């Protein structure tokens, strides 16, 4: 059903606004097309490590994401590469929150301080075959809103 | 018998193969491969028939009337064709292997699953009734394999373990005694459970992004970047060519089907895709 | 085999241009890093073998270990002297290469600009690449199949472009070297050494005392032996294009850009070059 | 050390600073110098509730309150409006960090007794309403920083930071 | 209405029951039957102080106190300690969640003051030392339900979940 | 005679080559070289066709129509193109060698595998049955080499054992010296068994880090450091160019394909990569 | 069972990442993982492997802590910031050779510890060269991405 | 009920048929009329709507040429043959939601200009997805038939 | 600088209202490069008054007016029928963005007011009957853009952009 197309509308709306610069927009449009096919070819866990590494989530970017879960005027700081990968990381976590695949409280306290990030990635790894089955239509919807609402470079 | 001749065969990809299923909303690859009813790659018999029929019409330019009877006219079809093709079932796909727990090293290996074999048993059980032709040598190999269901087995090997397509660990149990190499080659054949085989086979497909470059300024065009999906060279599909008796089905089976060695399936022909080899079961033993 | 590595140093001094220097240095690094181990009782060494020297010689007495770490510092300095002394440039295969390439580009109807630049002071190109990285901590841009150091065409193109972009502005540069929506109009080739006076490589040292040091208390020298390209070594490379439009700003810029830095550590005057010759073969 | 106090930034003027004089030394924590606001502290498991906002201690980790750390004393010996902990500043969850902070700091945090008689039922609130950020500037970002914005030329680059950074939660009673 | 209180799993002994008689009703938050312990509460920003198992509020999100919050009121004595907090049960971070809670839950937590004597440097205390692993069940788990230590062969799992689920921090000063 | 003409050729890298596959997630080489379904360097026929066609449309402006035929109309397709390229198999790659016990020192050697010669045999087997051209001489030389499969052999020289790419010590049997050269050169040619040769060939690619400089600080930018992958000079790729009887495939083979020796393939053209040479098997058999 | 390289990398990372204490030591390890995976390709696994053991400066105590890290959890890599980084990346490589069953753990510790079997290790590594090379360079790529994410930059 | 939808299909088509100057764009539209109508009723309306806008490549003078087509008859669709065709079909779908009062014409015309509002348009169509898919069927099926009949190869 | 007027392009002949002077120099916003017309301004909720038009403001979001944008003297220092606008030039709705735009220029669009006693009741209007297409390029294009039309050859390209680009909703009282 199309619940995941509505979910992809809320998520893309948050990202489309937290990305202030228009060159950061055109970078997320690049991520949305490439990172959906890489989860197809390479799988979820390889692509997630790739995403989460180019995101460069220190703690400053973690608060922007954690706030963006709740507020609608948070803004991603960084350059086109970092913000776009950090935006796409939020795109993914937004799905695992709004689908009960991860407890939102856990995911937020995991993103916060020091080391439960390793617990998250460890947990995300055990749910890998479940996630890569459920997000296909969602990430494919994100890929099409991106190509529609964001002009090319 | 319902069918005069029943000629099962194997389709060996000489190069990479691409029979297109056309773009679609829910695909995420722009030009995907023709899929099965349970996910695996396949060649629709409409692709087989049209490709083989077009091949024969130019290789045997004097047997037009013999081909037109068995494969149907093209201008004014006043009747039905006498020959049928069956959808090519994926028999075995080449997989990359890490030969752990052994010292006899293979670089790749043939991988098939049990659900893929059950569809080959079905094709053999059916056409062994709609025709007098029996395929006991093939039907008994397959049934010997199907007895060992619920376990990953290797036919002509001693492996005990492997890591297929860089990710998938398998604990193989060699077959009871041996099976004489259904697809004759030094490379072994693994029969996997379908939970693992689904992932292994999907990881073994070839997905390629291509671009189009502007003709004057050497730069990619606008949105001229698409992806495609090929089936690896050395893949094997199983199909059957059935025919009803007409005095042309006899010639077709006796003159045309013995000079059919290499045809060209699918599309992307200028990329060298689609060259393929037909290996008839009647002479594969 | 271990019987193969113990003999790797003799191979250097008996070929002098004919071993694969890339793989020879990498294999040496297995001995330089297990230096204490290759000295224990590893006999069956030839008369030519250069590891006996560190059995015979002796530098400390109170410490088995401190005797070795001193021997390892000498071994590194000795290795740098072997490479620089034995491995010397044979530039006939390069001239046959560039002359064959230049004929190819004429067949393709380019306008070629042959350029010879000569090393004036000890140069350092590709200092962060991997050649002696496992021994010296630094490297040199090395083509393991031409078996020669080289200057990447991307580096020459990037240095020349920074001089035109600085001199002739931005729109003139992106009209010669292009941008993300126009192809460049000038191609460059790697620069290979074609003739030296005596040496090709040459040892050097960098000994920082006060770097990331708070005060005089935390100061202490850290010597770093490494290899550099010797002076008076001629590097040949090519520049080819199709528009005469871009012929002038390249023949103009070249002589100026070489006298400044063309590599690493040129703030302290290491990699300074000298335009030796410019040949211009117009297409037609 | 410096006795530091935590002026959270909600939309309401319930801040009304209601704390004491500035550093008594030479250094704040929440700098605004050139790249915007800096070293913004974040507290988690607390909601300000802006009814004399005093960070009613929740237990849901998804509730947070941001704000500034300036050195001051807890309202002329009235040491019950706050928490008054003492921590080694390594645990200080800071944002937009600019430079080092030492090994021991005193932090005064406007605190309320757990607001029982009601289940918390807190909801997120952002900062908007340019009338408020204009207030907040002159209310704290100028009453505590009536030396900046003058050696600084561009001011309205950091005004939106209050709209951008300083989200919080509140019981919304 | 449904009175509940917090008792957690440290190495200390002051946590033995720490709070007088349970609700008397058949309601609890945490299951104990099939997969061992279920619905373990996790509170962030607090440490146990190696004794007197009360939770002094820290500020960093790294400090855990994992325990079994159960139904009851604190000690039927001086209420100088416990939080006395009410929340709609959608605002307490549970782990190993099971049959869903649906009502508001007034809860009591062993709260200590910030205790601004000196720095608070938390020390992660993992659970080990099998002798107390049974003592913990012997002093806590076997009484909260009494369906354990009496009819359970599942005591084996309760020996393991303590050394697998509960892991916290402590000031030790 | 399905194909009017069949023209195999070797692709000799004059300079280094970069033919990219785009950025991956399972690679650490952000701009990697095009790989194979086995991991060997390859040149997709889409990349061969794009480079050769674009180049041809400039060298021969007179015969533009003959090329908008066999290669393709390139503006509004309207018709299948009569020509066909096959994905360029890696024939032999320069790998750097260190060895003792040789009156002749070598800095690098050619290296191939048995799986790589099989695919060249497979190409020659099929195009000989799909056309008239039969290149029995190449088939002969390759059959003698394939009979030694399972052992690391040494053509064109007398090495006993070496270390390839600093990391793999191989003991090399000597195939009889009278098996003539297929590279047609003076340097030797090892044929490693495919378990070893898959490691040797992959580490034989040149891998270069590049940077981007802050124009004002004259220092490396933030995230301006990436790495690319080149295939060494003098690598040899094998491919075939097939056509169809068209009254213009005859001209394409007669005049165009003869006056075609040097072509620029792939990217990184402005840093000197991409120049390559086409060596037709017809005249270097 | 059998752990994939990304599961083997998470396991090896959360041991190192916890053994490192000073953030300056972690920022160094971030530099190691980024360029030591590019060096293994350019100069082979065996030359780069012993480079790491030398730069680790395996003292009697440093080597002692590294061994403890394989079994205990309270083990803490102690030393200079560049020593423990190379000492950590040595554990990363050893954790692979041991778990994949490529080299026995006893032989590995006995190699790093005593000098006599160190030369014998140089030999085993040249036989097992095609085994290590095929796999390791994608397990180390996971360690590289895990460090660029979980460790702030320079 | 839908007797005036065969009428609507004739004015909407005659608009698209004329703002398709290039011949290869008409042929490309004939390809959309056949295919897009059969995904709306197998894959769903909004899954196909997302696919349409993603291939339409909005945010240009094209997106304003659509607004003109609602009233003017001299407007033209310029762009990639695959773009004008996909965007011309977006007109067909939107032209119906206007003329049938499913979506307010004033909302849709200002949502096609204000970038911030387009997300609200897609959000509106999501709730009108079941209602729309039922009504457009006769209309789209007619557009499919008109395409196969009127759009011919030269 | 370079205050801009909005010379709308209706079928009417009266569009020679004497806003003549060039852009300081001739730094127009609309261009005729060689493919047609560029940077056409679009505003919504107006009507061209169909005789000596002044773009009467209605409220209909569907009503729009196109036309080329130039700088000139607003009626030779008679600004009574102009709107006195000045925009950051990103707020400009400017189709066919051939070349980037400035950051502030000024805008003086023709202006009138609702002439009461009658509803607006506007209708769409296209550009047909090529006589007008010549009439248009006769006054508003040639004598303002005499840059070309005597030298180039592709005026038939722009000659149909008059027909294709510029439609509007005239008053038609």
mmCIF file of C-alpha atoms in Angstrom, chain F residues 4-272:
data_model
loop_
_atom_site.group_PDB
_atom_site.id
_atom_site.type_symbol
_atom_site.label_atom_id
_atom_site.label_comp_id
_atom_site.label_asym_id
_atom_site.label_seq_id
_atom_site.Cartn_x
_atom_site.Cartn_y
_atom_site.Cartn_z
ATOM 1 C CA UNK F 4 29.311 -10.372 -42.952
ATOM 2 C CA UNK F 5 32.675 -9.579 -41.371
ATOM 3 C CA UNK F 6 34.271 -10.572 -38.075
ATOM 4 C CA UNK F 7 37.321 -8.546 -37.058
ATOM 5 C CA UNK F 8 39.001 -9.488 -33.787
ATOM 6 C CA UNK F 9 41.625 -7.098 -32.531
ATOM 7 C CA UNK F 10 43.959 -6.484 -29.634
ATOM 8 C CA UNK F 11 43.771 -3.202 -27.737
ATOM 9 C CA UNK F 12 47.266 -2.078 -26.740
ATOM 10 C CA UNK F 13 47.330 0.665 -24.123
ATOM 11 C CA UNK F 14 49.868 3.206 -25.366
ATOM 12 C CA UNK F 15 49.528 5.381 -22.278
ATOM 13 C CA UNK F 16 47.708 4.463 -19.092
ATOM 14 C CA UNK F 17 43.986 3.874 -19.501
ATOM 15 C CA UNK F 18 41.090 4.872 -17.302
ATOM 16 C CA UNK F 19 37.722 3.417 -18.249
ATOM 17 C CA UNK F 20 35.542 3.943 -15.226
ATOM 18 C CA UNK F 21 32.653 2.008 -13.747
ATOM 19 C CA UNK F 22 31.471 4.872 -11.557
ATOM 20 C CA UNK F 23 31.728 5.079 -7.805
ATOM 21 C CA UNK F 24 30.777 1.953 -5.882
ATOM 22 C CA UNK F 25 30.172 1.137 -2.239
ATOM 23 C CA UNK F 26 32.177 -2.087 -2.176
ATOM 24 C CA UNK F 27 35.300 -0.387 -3.569
ATOM 25 C CA UNK F 28 37.841 1.883 -1.871
ATOM 26 C CA UNK F 29 39.093 3.287 -5.177
ATOM 27 C CA UNK F 30 36.489 6.014 -5.714
ATOM 28 C CA UNK F 31 37.106 6.121 -9.457
ATOM 29 C CA UNK F 32 37.608 2.415 -10.234
ATOM 30 C CA UNK F 33 38.375 0.705 -13.504
ATOM 31 C CA UNK F 34 35.670 -1.280 -15.264
ATOM 32 C CA UNK F 35 35.692 -4.796 -13.872
ATOM 33 C CA UNK F 36 34.460 -8.169 -15.103
ATOM 34 C CA UNK F 37 32.081 -10.822 -13.850
ATOM 35 C CA UNK F 38 35.267 -12.434 -12.516
ATOM 36 C CA UNK F 39 37.054 -9.300 -11.300
ATOM 37 C CA UNK F 40 39.405 -8.772 -14.199
ATOM 38 C CA UNK F 41 39.789 -5.386 -15.878
ATOM 39 C CA UNK F 42 37.393 -5.086 -18.788
ATOM 40 C CA UNK F 43 36.287 -2.508 -21.331
ATOM 41 C CA UNK F 44 32.529 -2.708 -21.808
ATOM 42 C CA UNK F 45 31.585 -2.708 -25.472
ATOM 43 C CA UNK F 46 29.467 0.356 -24.750
ATOM 44 C CA UNK F 47 32.719 2.127 -23.906
ATOM 45 C CA UNK F 48 34.511 0.661 -26.925
ATOM 46 C CA UNK F 49 31.684 1.613 -29.251
ATOM 47 C CA UNK F 50 31.276 5.105 -27.847
ATOM 48 C CA UNK F 51 34.957 5.948 -28.165
ATOM 49 C CA UNK F 52 35.509 4.375 -31.574
ATOM 50 C CA UNK F 53 32.313 5.779 -33.079
ATOM 51 C CA UNK F 54 32.850 9.340 -31.848
ATOM 52 C CA UNK F 55 36.444 9.178 -33.042
ATOM 53 C CA UNK F 56 35.456 7.741 -36.416
ATOM 54 C CA UNK F 57 32.890 10.480 -37.018
ATOM 55 C CA UNK F 58 35.808 12.946 -36.928
ATOM 56 C CA UNK F 59 38.573 11.121 -38.800
ATOM 57 C CA UNK F 60 36.209 10.245 -41.678
ATOM 58 C CA UNK F 61 33.786 13.137 -42.245
ATOM 59 C CA UNK F 62 33.449 11.959 -45.852
ATOM 60 C CA UNK F 63 32.074 8.529 -44.883
ATOM 61 C CA UNK F 64 29.715 9.855 -42.206
ATOM 62 C CA UNK F 65 26.801 7.939 -43.722
ATOM 63 C CA UNK F 66 28.662 4.619 -43.731
ATOM 64 C CA UNK F 67 29.245 5.125 -39.998
ATOM 65 C CA UNK F 68 25.705 6.254 -39.140
ATOM 66 C CA UNK F 69 25.061 2.851 -40.639
ATOM 67 C CA UNK F 70 27.111 0.029 -39.109
ATOM 68 C CA UNK F 71 27.752 1.936 -35.879
ATOM 69 C CA UNK F 72 24.420 3.773 -35.586
ATOM 70 C CA UNK F 73 22.441 6.801 -36.703
ATOM 71 C CA UNK F 74 23.057 8.493 -33.347
ATOM 72 C CA UNK F 75 20.290 11.132 -33.567
ATOM 73 C CA UNK F 76 16.949 9.364 -34.096
ATOM 74 C CA UNK F 77 17.631 5.629 -34.101
ATOM 75 C CA UNK F 78 14.963 4.529 -36.593
ATOM 76 C CA UNK F 79 17.037 1.428 -37.383
ATOM 77 C CA UNK F 80 19.311 -1.071 -35.689
ATOM 78 C CA UNK F 81 23.001 -0.547 -36.315
ATOM 79 C CA UNK F 82 24.723 -3.205 -38.376
ATOM 80 C CA UNK F 83 27.880 -3.395 -36.280
ATOM 81 C CA UNK F 84 28.659 -5.145 -33.045
ATOM 82 C CA UNK F 85 31.430 -4.841 -30.477
ATOM 83 C CA UNK F 86 32.205 -7.481 -27.868
ATOM 84 C CA UNK F 87 33.305 -6.552 -24.356
ATOM 85 C CA UNK F 88 37.084 -6.312 -24.417
ATOM 86 C CA UNK F 89 38.557 -9.213 -22.473
ATOM 87 C CA UNK F 90 41.806 -8.583 -20.659
ATOM 88 C CA UNK F 91 44.377 -10.584 -22.585
ATOM 89 C CA UNK F 92 47.609 -9.861 -20.700
ATOM 90 C CA UNK F 93 48.408 -7.191 -18.124
ATOM 91 C CA UNK F 94 51.865 -5.872 -17.174
ATOM 92 C CA UNK F 95 52.661 -7.021 -13.665
ATOM 93 C CA UNK F 96 55.851 -6.005 -11.914
ATOM 94 C CA UNK F 97 58.247 -8.837 -11.177
ATOM 95 C CA UNK F 98 61.303 -9.514 -9.036
ATOM 96 C CA UNK F 99 63.255 -12.698 -9.635
ATOM 97 C CA UNK F 100 66.698 -14.244 -9.304
ATOM 98 C CA UNK F 101 68.393 -16.885 -11.485
ATOM 99 C CA UNK F 102 68.099 -15.292 -14.910
ATOM 100 C CA UNK F 103 70.727 -14.219 -17.432
ATOM 101 C CA UNK F 104 68.130 -11.610 -18.476
ATOM 102 C CA UNK F 105 66.631 -9.192 -15.930
ATOM 103 C CA UNK F 106 63.041 -8.005 -16.150
ATOM 104 C CA UNK F 107 61.365 -5.075 -14.450
ATOM 105 C CA UNK F 108 57.868 -6.209 -15.433
ATOM 106 C CA UNK F 109 56.249 -9.148 -17.181
ATOM 107 C CA UNK F 110 52.990 -9.930 -18.923
ATOM 108 C CA UNK F 111 50.529 -11.946 -16.863
ATOM 109 C CA UNK F 112 47.370 -13.750 -17.927
ATOM 110 C CA UNK F 113 45.216 -16.549 -16.561
ATOM 111 C CA UNK F 114 43.504 -19.604 -17.960
ATOM 112 C CA UNK F 115 40.016 -18.203 -17.415
ATOM 113 C CA UNK F 116 41.136 -15.196 -19.443
ATOM 114 C CA UNK F 117 42.316 -17.318 -22.364
ATOM 115 C CA UNK F 118 39.163 -19.434 -22.252
ATOM 116 C CA UNK F 119 37.010 -16.360 -22.810
ATOM 117 C CA UNK F 120 39.246 -15.514 -25.758
ATOM 118 C CA UNK F 121 38.828 -19.055 -27.051
ATOM 119 C CA UNK F 122 35.088 -18.793 -26.418
ATOM 120 C CA UNK F 123 34.984 -15.593 -28.463
ATOM 121 C CA UNK F 124 36.861 -17.195 -31.349
ATOM 122 C CA UNK F 125 34.807 -20.389 -31.149
ATOM 123 C CA UNK F 126 31.460 -18.654 -31.540
ATOM 124 C CA UNK F 127 32.322 -15.975 -34.096
ATOM 125 C CA UNK F 128 33.838 -18.720 -36.232
ATOM 126 C CA UNK F 129 30.482 -20.509 -36.184
ATOM 127 C CA UNK F 130 28.506 -17.270 -36.565
ATOM 128 C CA UNK F 131 30.526 -16.132 -39.584
ATOM 129 C CA UNK F 132 32.959 -17.365 -42.217
ATOM 130 C CA UNK F 133 36.178 -16.059 -40.666
ATOM 131 C CA UNK F 134 38.043 -18.899 -38.958
ATOM 132 C CA UNK F 135 41.180 -17.862 -37.075
ATOM 133 C CA UNK F 136 42.647 -21.314 -36.619
ATOM 134 C CA UNK F 137 46.110 -19.898 -35.907
ATOM 135 C CA UNK F 138 45.032 -18.033 -32.774
ATOM 136 C CA UNK F 139 42.896 -21.008 -31.756
ATOM 137 C CA UNK F 140 45.944 -23.239 -32.180
ATOM 138 C CA UNK F 141 48.285 -21.116 -30.070
ATOM 139 C CA UNK F 142 45.647 -20.840 -27.352
ATOM 140 C CA UNK F 143 44.835 -24.561 -27.353
ATOM 141 C CA UNK F 144 48.458 -25.469 -26.636
ATOM 142 C CA UNK F 145 48.443 -23.025 -23.727
ATOM 143 C CA UNK F 146 45.115 -24.280 -22.399
ATOM 144 C CA UNK F 147 46.381 -27.868 -22.320
ATOM 145 C CA UNK F 148 48.779 -26.838 -19.537
ATOM 146 C CA UNK F 149 45.932 -25.604 -17.333
ATOM 147 C CA UNK F 150 46.329 -26.161 -13.612
ATOM 148 C CA UNK F 151 49.990 -25.103 -13.539
ATOM 149 C CA UNK F 152 51.692 -21.716 -13.675
ATOM 150 C CA UNK F 153 53.554 -21.837 -16.968
ATOM 151 C CA UNK F 154 56.037 -19.425 -18.550
ATOM 152 C CA UNK F 155 56.038 -18.545 -22.206
ATOM 153 C CA UNK F 156 58.712 -16.666 -24.094
ATOM 154 C CA UNK F 157 61.375 -17.051 -21.382
ATOM 155 C CA UNK F 158 62.996 -19.360 -18.825
ATOM 156 C CA UNK F 159 62.086 -18.048 -15.366
ATOM 157 C CA UNK F 160 61.975 -20.685 -12.644
ATOM 158 C CA UNK F 161 60.256 -18.772 -9.836
ATOM 159 C CA UNK F 162 59.525 -15.130 -9.088
ATOM 160 C CA UNK F 163 57.588 -12.802 -6.806
ATOM 161 C CA UNK F 164 54.766 -11.027 -8.616
ATOM 162 C CA UNK F 165 53.601 -7.649 -7.298
ATOM 163 C CA UNK F 166 55.683 -7.873 -4.121
ATOM 164 C CA UNK F 167 53.306 -10.366 -2.588
ATOM 165 C CA UNK F 168 52.865 -13.638 -4.525
ATOM 166 C CA UNK F 169 55.729 -16.102 -4.883
ATOM 167 C CA UNK F 170 55.016 -18.433 -7.801
ATOM 168 C CA UNK F 171 56.998 -21.394 -9.106
ATOM 169 C CA UNK F 172 56.726 -21.334 -12.882
ATOM 170 C CA UNK F 173 56.904 -24.343 -15.140
ATOM 171 C CA UNK F 174 58.225 -23.688 -18.631
ATOM 172 C CA UNK F 175 55.921 -24.394 -21.527
ATOM 173 C CA UNK F 176 57.943 -25.552 -24.521
ATOM 174 C CA UNK F 177 59.875 -22.658 -26.021
ATOM 175 C CA UNK F 178 58.516 -23.343 -29.513
ATOM 176 C CA UNK F 179 54.968 -22.175 -28.729
ATOM 177 C CA UNK F 180 55.246 -18.820 -30.524
ATOM 178 C CA UNK F 181 54.540 -15.426 -29.037
ATOM 179 C CA UNK F 182 50.969 -14.175 -29.029
ATOM 180 C CA UNK F 183 51.813 -10.684 -27.746
ATOM 181 C CA UNK F 184 54.369 -10.526 -30.593
ATOM 182 C CA UNK F 185 57.002 -8.802 -28.456
ATOM 183 C CA UNK F 186 60.199 -9.437 -26.518
ATOM 184 C CA UNK F 187 59.015 -9.476 -22.898
ATOM 185 C CA UNK F 188 57.830 -12.838 -21.517
ATOM 186 C CA UNK F 189 54.280 -13.887 -20.658
ATOM 187 C CA UNK F 190 53.204 -15.847 -17.591
ATOM 188 C CA UNK F 191 49.947 -17.795 -17.500
ATOM 189 C CA UNK F 192 49.002 -18.216 -13.856
ATOM 190 C CA UNK F 193 46.354 -20.555 -12.568
ATOM 191 C CA UNK F 194 43.254 -18.523 -11.943
ATOM 192 C CA UNK F 195 43.311 -18.695 -8.147
ATOM 193 C CA UNK F 196 46.724 -17.016 -8.068
ATOM 194 C CA UNK F 197 46.270 -14.886 -11.184
ATOM 195 C CA UNK F 198 43.132 -13.264 -9.806
ATOM 196 C CA UNK F 199 45.190 -11.741 -6.999
ATOM 197 C CA UNK F 200 48.185 -10.868 -9.164
ATOM 198 C CA UNK F 201 46.180 -9.190 -11.916
ATOM 199 C CA UNK F 202 44.078 -7.083 -9.556
ATOM 200 C CA UNK F 203 47.071 -5.675 -7.691
ATOM 201 C CA UNK F 204 48.678 -4.977 -11.075
ATOM 202 C CA UNK F 205 46.526 -1.899 -11.722
ATOM 203 C CA UNK F 206 47.999 1.529 -11.078
ATOM 204 C CA UNK F 207 46.153 3.341 -8.294
ATOM 205 C CA UNK F 208 46.855 7.054 -7.930
ATOM 206 C CA UNK F 209 45.606 9.553 -5.362
ATOM 207 C CA UNK F 210 44.831 13.058 -6.606
ATOM 208 C CA UNK F 211 44.010 16.223 -4.673
ATOM 209 C CA UNK F 212 42.424 19.642 -5.087
ATOM 210 C CA UNK F 213 44.212 22.735 -3.807
ATOM 211 C CA UNK F 214 42.756 25.662 -1.882
ATOM 212 C CA UNK F 215 43.446 28.521 -4.258
ATOM 213 C CA UNK F 216 44.158 30.960 -1.407
ATOM 214 C CA UNK F 217 45.777 28.837 1.314
ATOM 215 C CA UNK F 218 47.599 26.784 -1.361
ATOM 216 C CA UNK F 219 46.736 23.717 0.723
ATOM 217 C CA UNK F 220 44.587 20.651 0.096
ATOM 218 C CA UNK F 221 40.860 21.397 0.106
ATOM 219 C CA UNK F 222 38.429 19.725 2.492
ATOM 220 C CA UNK F 223 37.376 16.440 0.921
ATOM 221 C CA UNK F 224 39.324 17.253 -2.224
ATOM 222 C CA UNK F 225 41.362 14.049 -2.058
ATOM 223 C CA UNK F 226 40.295 11.053 -4.132
ATOM 224 C CA UNK F 227 41.931 8.096 -5.846
ATOM 225 C CA UNK F 228 41.615 6.679 -9.355
ATOM 226 C CA UNK F 229 42.628 3.433 -11.024
ATOM 227 C CA UNK F 230 44.556 3.102 -14.265
ATOM 228 C CA UNK F 231 45.565 0.047 -16.231
ATOM 229 C CA UNK F 232 49.306 0.106 -17.024
ATOM 230 C CA UNK F 233 50.854 0.972 -20.342
ATOM 231 C CA UNK F 234 51.063 -1.871 -22.855
ATOM 232 C CA UNK F 235 48.139 -3.822 -21.425
ATOM 233 C CA UNK F 236 46.450 -5.926 -24.087
ATOM 234 C CA UNK F 237 42.686 -6.303 -24.376
ATOM 235 C CA UNK F 238 40.990 -8.649 -26.828
ATOM 236 C CA UNK F 239 37.709 -7.775 -28.517
ATOM 237 C CA UNK F 240 35.818 -8.437 -31.744
ATOM 238 C CA UNK F 241 33.964 -6.136 -34.138
ATOM 239 C CA UNK F 242 31.147 -7.894 -35.987
ATOM 240 C CA UNK F 243 29.019 -6.664 -38.879
ATOM 241 C CA UNK F 244 26.105 -7.649 -41.080
ATOM 242 C CA UNK F 245 25.820 -7.893 -44.856
ATOM 243 C CA UNK F 246 24.825 -4.366 -45.760
ATOM 244 C CA UNK F 247 26.710 -3.077 -48.845
ATOM 245 C CA UNK F 248 28.266 -0.790 -46.227
ATOM 246 C CA UNK F 249 29.677 -3.268 -43.766
ATOM 247 C CA UNK F 250 31.771 -4.129 -46.816
ATOM 248 C CA UNK F 251 33.037 -0.551 -47.022
ATOM 249 C CA UNK F 252 33.344 -0.249 -43.246
ATOM 250 C CA UNK F 253 35.650 -3.262 -43.234
ATOM 251 C CA UNK F 254 37.445 -2.419 -46.483
ATOM 252 C CA UNK F 255 38.395 1.205 -45.891
ATOM 253 C CA UNK F 256 37.473 2.375 -42.380
ATOM 254 C CA UNK F 257 38.741 -0.564 -40.326
ATOM 255 C CA UNK F 258 42.039 -0.552 -42.210
ATOM 256 C CA UNK F 259 42.727 3.149 -41.612
ATOM 257 C CA UNK F 260 42.112 2.790 -37.880
ATOM 258 C CA UNK F 261 45.118 2.311 -35.620
ATOM 259 C CA UNK F 262 45.019 4.828 -32.753
ATOM 260 C CA UNK F 263 41.963 5.724 -30.667
ATOM 261 C CA UNK F 264 41.359 7.483 -27.344
ATOM 262 C CA UNK F 265 39.290 5.443 -24.884
ATOM 263 C CA UNK F 266 37.732 6.248 -21.565
ATOM 264 C CA UNK F 267 38.238 9.287 -19.393
ATOM 265 C CA UNK F 268 41.072 11.328 -17.920
ATOM 266 C CA UNK F 269 41.966 12.312 -21.465
ATOM 267 C CA UNK F 270 43.471 15.674 -20.501
ATOM 268 C CA UNK F 271 46.012 14.106 -18.163
ATOM 269 C CA UNK F 272 47.331 11.939 -20.975
#
